[PDB]
């Protein structure tokens, strides 16, 4: 009897769906809705209207290029009165002459994306299936069952709906606030976001599974952090917004600015954050002039539960789109629980630095990381300081025990090993001890410069850099640097002093060890031989010598001796021929022992290349 239904059209109820779903700006032409919340379609039929007693209607939805029911990317569901909460469902909520108003709901953990919605109409003995249309399904911060649920309306407004904000920069002391147009809801932007997902490496590797994994904001946040930077494929490699950048792509704060735009667009509550660092003739700074430290650094935080981790990690997750990184729970960073996925040590190193001295074991505060961590206040044009979410107050028990959890005893001093003399070559050592059970891989910078008695530094006279020095547990090393006369001879100060400095960097936790030591290059000793016998009577001969310590010969060599109680007249002696390298120059002079007790003979040796060398000898 009854003839099959003919659909005249489907009304996508854009105005009503858009407002309820907080997607109004996105629903000018196509339907955009959020998961775990009912939305509406109105069917107009040509001819007779739906009759439940006769007509059976079934819906099918698919997303992606390899949809399956088991993967959650395909569903089939009948139009009926019973509504199973948490499932794909459709039910009648209004029936007029020629119209049929439907209420559909998706699971709160449905993969996000572009769905094709089809309808199968069946009047017993016959059926006809066809395409009703499409809708995009987004994350839903308004739905208590959704992983990105945020229990505060004003926060949902700020971190999802608001299209402009501030990205903080400048410095910790002069914080500047660049205003920025995220423009997540502008024409074309949503489609661009979906494309970015569709060309990510995991899609290429397994499209069906990628599309299925888009049920998770953990997974989606992760993919986006990775996609912002052109490894290639990525987006980035002046402006005041994200929109232009994304449009051109389809055809440093900027990295975070773009991630925020994309994440807000997809429905993940997100904010840009800025960390400031500061510095205060230091090896460290010299080092920095691919893990640079900058005056500031930006990333994003996104809001979600973490069922993939142990309990207690829901909330803000750090994601770092800077040249995949995250998401890591901010609280895991503050707790030094660095085994928490994803990439915790990297985020920890952005807000921590442990700098220790051995300027002979003291704390060095010339490098300071993790200050004034900043993000825009909710619903107000001002700055919120969130330093506290990342680190405990300096000096607290909680700070220290987090330091411990993060580190699970390393030491370094400068050593020489033997006598050091002007003119000779010799090694210096960075002696490094590692009385821990851990294994470390460090950068080492070890280098020497002349230095004046006033503390001013001369030119470099030795450098050894090692990219990757390994330290085994419970072991030590003496790493040598050769100091060459040839390299220091020309650049010595008034002193015979050289400053040795070493810097050990463990870049994972972000630890820094300095050691520093001044060395004195001894002058040759003047040997004074007393020939005869100390007679309160008379007549004595003193012999003085000096072995040349240079690898080169000395010219213009002259001794000068004097000593009240021994000689009555000072005696200068010019040595005629130059003294060869290693040669021992020798002169003699006569003495007339004045009186009885002790006397001191005082000698000065002079030369063109070696000057002001002194000696003395007591007598009697």
């Amino acid at each position: 009897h009854a003839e099959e239904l003919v659909l005249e059209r489907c009304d996508l109820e854009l105005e009503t769906n858009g407002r309820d779903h907080h997607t109004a700006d996105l629903c000018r032409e196509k339907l955009v809705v959020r998961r775990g919340q009912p939305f509406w379609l109105t069917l107009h039929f040509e001819g007779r209207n739906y009759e439940a007693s006769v007509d059976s209607l079934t819906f099918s939805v698919v997303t992606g290029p390899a949809p399956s029911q088991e993967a959650g990317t395909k569903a089939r569901f009948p139009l009926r009165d019973a509504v199973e909460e948490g499932d794909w469902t459709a039910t009648v909520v209004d029936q007029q002459d020629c119209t049929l108003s439907l209420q559909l709901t998706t699971p709160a953990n449905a993969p996000i994306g572009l769905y094709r919605l089809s309808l199968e109409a069946s009047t017993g003995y016959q059926g006809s299936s066809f395409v009703l249309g499409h809708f995009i399904l987004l994350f839903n911060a308004w739905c208590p069952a959704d992983a990105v649920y945020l229990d505060s309306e004003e926060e949902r407004q700020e971190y999802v709906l608001t299209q402009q904000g501030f990205i903080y920069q400048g410095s910790a002391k002069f914080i500047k606030n660049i205003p920025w147009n995220f423009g997540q809801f502008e024409d074309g932007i949503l489609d661009i976001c979906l494309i970015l997902l569709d060309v990510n490496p995991k899609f290429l590797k397994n499209a069906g599974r990628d599309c299925s994994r888009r049920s998770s904001p953990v997974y989606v946040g992760r993919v986006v952090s990775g996609m912002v930077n052109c490894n290639d494929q990525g987006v980035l490699l002046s402006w005041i917004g994200s929109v232009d950048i994304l449009r051109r792509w389809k055809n440093c704060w900027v990295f975070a600015a773009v991630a925020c735009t994309v994440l807000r667009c997809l429905g993940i509550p997100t904010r840009v954050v800025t960390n400031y660092n500061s510095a205060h003739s230091n090896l460290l700074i010299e080092y920095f002039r691919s893990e640079m430290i900058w005056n500031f650094h930006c990333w994003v935080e996104s809001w979600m539960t973490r069922p993939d981790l142990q309990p207690g990690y829901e909330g803000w997750q750090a994601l770092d789109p800077t040249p995949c990184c995250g998401p890591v729970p901010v609280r895991a960073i503050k707790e030094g629980d660095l085994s928490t996925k994803y990439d915790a040590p990297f985020v920890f190193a952005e807000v921590n630095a442990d700098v220790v001295d051995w300027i002979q074991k003291s704390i060095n505060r010339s490098l300071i990381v993790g200050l004034k961590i900043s993000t825009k206040s909710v619903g107000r044009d001002e700055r919120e300081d969130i330093t506290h979410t990342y680190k405990y107050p300096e000096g607290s028990s909680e700070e220290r025990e987090a330091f411990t959890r993060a580190n699970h005893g390393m030491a370094m001093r400068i050593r020489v090993g033997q006598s050091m003399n002007m003119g000779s070559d010799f090694d210096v050592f960075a002696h490094i001890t590692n009385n821990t059970a851990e294994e470390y891989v460090c950068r080492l910078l070890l280098c020497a410069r002349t230095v004046s008695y006033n503390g001013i530094l001369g030119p470099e006279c030795g450098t050894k850099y090692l990219l990757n020095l390994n330290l085994e547990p419970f072991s030590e090393k003496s790493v040598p640097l050769c100091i060459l006369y040839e390299k220091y001879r020309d650049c010595l100060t008034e002193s015979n002093l050289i400053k040795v400095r070493a810097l050990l960097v463990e870049p994972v936790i972000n630890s820094y060890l300095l050691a520093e030591r001044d060395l004195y290059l001894e002058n040759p000793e003047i040997k004074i031989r007393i020939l005869g016998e100390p007679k309160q009577k008379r007549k004595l001969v003193a012999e003085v010598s000096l072995q040349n310590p240079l690898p080169v010969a000395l010219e213009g060599c002259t001794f000068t001796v004097e000593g009240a109680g021994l000689t009555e007249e000072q005696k200068t002696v010019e040595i005629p021929d130059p003294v060869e390298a290693g040669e021992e120059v020798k002169v003699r002079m006569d003495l007339l022992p004045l009186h009885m007790g002790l006397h001191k003979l005082v000698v000065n040796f002079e030369s063109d290349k070696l000057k002001a060398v002194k000696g003395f000898r007591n007598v009697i």
Partner: peptide
């Protein structure tokens, strides 16, 4: 953005 400037290196320290």
């Amino acid at each position: 953005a400037v290196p320290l």
